[PDB]
Paper text:
To rationalize their different catalytic regioselectivities, structural analyses involving X-ray crystallography and computational methods were conducted. We solved the crystal structure of an SbSOMT-resveratrol-nicotinamide adenine dinucleotide (β-NAD) ternary complex (diffracted to 1.72 Å resolution, Fig. 4d; β-NAD was utilized as an additive to improve crystallization), an SbSOMT-resveratrol binary complex, and two ternary complexes reproduced with pinostilbene or pterostilbene (diffracted at 2.10 and 2.56 Å, respectively). All complexes were in high structural resemblance and depicted as a homodimer with an open conformation. Of the three hydroxyl groups on resveratrol capable of forming hydrogen bonds, only the methyl-accepting 3-OH group (A-ring) formed direct hydrogen bonds to SbSOMT residues, including the catalytic residues His282 (2.80 Å) and Asp283 (3.26 Å). The same binding mode was adopted for pinostilbene or pterostilbene in the corresponding SbSOMT co-crystals. Overall, these structures depicted a productive substrate orientation within the substrate binding pocket which greatly favors A-ring O-methylation. Following 3-O-methylation of resveratrol, the pinostilbene intermediate will need to be dissociated and re-inserted in order to re-position the A-ring for 5-O-methylation to produce pterostilbene. Kinetic parameters of SbSOMT and SbCOMT were then determined using pinostilbene as a substrate since SbSOMT rapidly converts resveratrol into pterostilbene, thus preventing accurate quantification of pinostilbene produced. Results revealed the superior catalytic performance (kcat/Km and specific activity) of SbSOMT over SbCOMT and SbOMT4 towards pinostilbene, although SbSOMT showed a higher Km value.
Whilst SbSOMT shows global structural resemblance to SbCOMT, molecular characterizations illustrate two hydrophobic residues (Ile144/Phe337) crucial for substrate binding orientation leading to 3,5-bis-O-methylations in the A-ring. The catalytic residues of SbSOMT are highly conserved with all reported COMTs, including His282 as the key nucleophile, whereas Asp283, Glu310, and Glu342 collectively charge the basicity or confine His282 in its reactive conformation.
Author numbering:
A (entry chain A): 15 to 377
B (entry chain B): 16 to 377
Write the structure that this text describes.
Amino acid sequence: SARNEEDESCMFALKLLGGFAVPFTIKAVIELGVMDQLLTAERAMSAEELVAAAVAAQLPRPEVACTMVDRLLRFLASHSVVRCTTEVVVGTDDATTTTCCRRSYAASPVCKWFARNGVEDSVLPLGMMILNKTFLDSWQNITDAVLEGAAPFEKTYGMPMFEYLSTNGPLNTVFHEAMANHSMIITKKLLKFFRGFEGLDVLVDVGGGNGTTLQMIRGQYKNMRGINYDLPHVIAQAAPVEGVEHVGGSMFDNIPRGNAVLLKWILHDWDDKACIKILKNCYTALHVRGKVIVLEYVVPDEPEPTLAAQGAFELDLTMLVTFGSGKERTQREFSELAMEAGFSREFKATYIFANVWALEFTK
Amino acid sequence: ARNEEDESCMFALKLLGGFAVPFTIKAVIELGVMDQLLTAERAMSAEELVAAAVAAQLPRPEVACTMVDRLLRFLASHSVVRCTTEVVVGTDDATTTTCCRRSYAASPVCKWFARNGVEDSVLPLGMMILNKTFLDSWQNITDAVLEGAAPFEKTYGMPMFEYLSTNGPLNTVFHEAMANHSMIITKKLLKFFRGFEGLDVLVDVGGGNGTTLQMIRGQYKNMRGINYDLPHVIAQAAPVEGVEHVGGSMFDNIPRGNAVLLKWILHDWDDKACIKILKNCYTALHVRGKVIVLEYVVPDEPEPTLAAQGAFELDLTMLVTFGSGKERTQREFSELAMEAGFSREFKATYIFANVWALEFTK
Ligand SMILES: NC(=O)c1ccc[n+]([C@@H]2O[C@H](COP(=O)([O-])OP(=O)(O)OC[C@H]3O[C@@H](n4cnc5c(N)ncnc54)[C@H](O)[C@@H]3O)[C@@H](O)[C@H]2O)c1
Ligand SMILES: NC(=O)c1ccc[n+]([C@@H]2O[C@H](COP(=O)([O-])OP(=O)(O)OC[C@H]3O[C@@H](n4cnc5c(N)ncnc54)[C@H](O)[C@@H]3O)[C@@H](O)[C@H]2O)c1
Ligand SMILES: COc1cc(O)cc(/C=C/c2ccc(O)cc2)c1
Ligand SMILES: COc1cc(O)cc(/C=C/c2ccc(O)cc2)c1
């Protein structure tokens, strides 16, 4: 609609500067309980009906709350996050932010990924880490961190993230729930789309937590045995799982022996030398023809302006912000690390879901 | 594995990640890399852009280059910069990818981030939009809504204009953003808007040091100006030929003239406060006088266009800053004017960057 190229140029610059407004608006609609009412609603609902349904608490300024929610949802409607219908009101009205007319709102399909059921296959626990204030604050310190060649997180909090989490119980839970949430989704998709668990006697899951992933995998492959390998303090908290041995240890020291080792979102935390050491421990732990299964995004060789590529470079920036030298890798960069660790010139890539690939390297 | 379910999920993650572009552009500006992009003659690698932007010896110069490379690659995937890739005659150590070296050029949009070309930039406004103090309020929307309060006030315990009195650096950031936007809009007004023709006296409510009036008089030499602003702002203004500085509150009175300019005033305020301002404009105006409202105009329905999204984005900015400040539709502006006494006579002239000049007539 801009009146010339100069005008459209200016508005695009403002748009680029303002991209934080959508995520922060979504967070509020979620936290208010409005997004869950949209998701269970049988028809479109006005801001007033959404607030009445979402809030049990008696509000001091209920009319202000309703118009504010109307403004939040109208903004998300402009971004196709929700559907909006407008009707004429016969009467007077003040639980909408316009003269004659009342908006009613329905969830778009994308909204199901924000569900608070948590495991209805939602990414909400991941989203709450993505938009966590403690983590977001690091993004304001990128400049100085680059100048020192440090992680923005380190430059913000004085120390690496994994150290800091030991000192912040609440942030630690947010982080672990996000990890667990993404793990659950990808594990399910793996059992739908990936065939590389066929023929395995023993699978070693590094960073397996309580061993949920191995348990779900054994649900489909009943004769496979699992080793759940994680830090001693994580293993101490792990209840028995049938067919899974919990083993405490550092992946930098050793990996337990097996037919395959699973690394999900491990390598992208670490620089190339650390990755090579992890893959060398995988290599010594495997019998010949054994495999490493890497569950990671793969960035394209060039910066393609696609939805998937943008999300992969967005994850690269998250890694820069969090760890500094943690990073997302191309297929070739993954191949090179594996060959450095001793693996053959034999590469498989199976696309799974949500930008995650299963890359398999073979001894 | 890639279907509608997959696209849906990626879309969800994209919506949650929208902050990454703005934060990355900020870093690239603040490192001085954007300015090197804007003066460059050709695509430059991260290494070249760092060497050119940074005076100091860095402790970890190769880490800094590879980090900038990653920032720029991300911006390339969003079409903010142009990237080309060439095979390294050897082995790099200042690009993230060893085979190959990326070089980058500014896209046209980057001119809007310039630190001082001789043209228009929105960089002072952008520094306000991405200022940490202001951004921190957006993390407090849920509790401010439940209380019916402005997120900003819930975050800092006072109204934004009161807070600026307590934070001189933020006060500068705010005023420079307003002055930047006002400068661009006043020049576009002199280009496109014809409603200053014929006016004896123009009253600029919130006119600061009188720069707007000074510029308009530069084109309309027989017009006189009344620069109306708070006494403390007027105390600081130097004399302006053909302009009288007057101190006061727009809630008490407006100086009389043929036209009153209200730029980004009404959107700070609720309907009751707007009606007070407009009733004061009405009584102040001589007959056939006009209020000239310089605001964004939100469409009647939430259209998914670049311009509409920009207007609802400013709406949420007003929500966050003031709570009850808000963007309006044409109909809502008309209705406030009619409540203040103005006639059923409405003009709208599109100016630039989503701003309209709306005129109401006594
Ligand atoms: N960059 C490196 O090469 C590097 C980094 C850290 C530790 N190490 C080596 O590791 C040994 C132990 O030192 P430490 O206790 O600081 O390191 P650690 O065992 O705590 O390892 C560091 C990080 O790696 C991850 N990790 C380690 N083992 C894991 C496992 N089984 N599952 C999931 N994640 C795991 C965790 O995120 C942890 O914070 C030392 O010999 C040390 O040199 C090497
Ligand atoms: N939106 C609302 O919060 C709301 C609601 C209903 C009524 N009101 C009315 O507004 C009053 C609150 O305002 P206040 O008492 O804090 O006063 P105030 O005028 O001192 O408020 C500060 C702001 O007023 C503006 N201002 C006032 N006169 C100006 C002038 N001549 N030139 C430029 N800018 C000028 C500036 O934007 C300044 O930052 C209420 O007492 C009532 O009259 C406001
Ligand atoms: C914080 O207080 C104020 C007061 C005011 O009068 C205007 C603004 C405008 C902000 C803005 C943000 C994003 C954009 O893309 C374009 C403008 C903010
Ligand atoms: C904070 O530390 C970590 C460690 C880790 O292994 C993964 C992530 C992933 C974040 C992320 C962000 C945005 C998305 O869209 C998708 C994932 C973050």
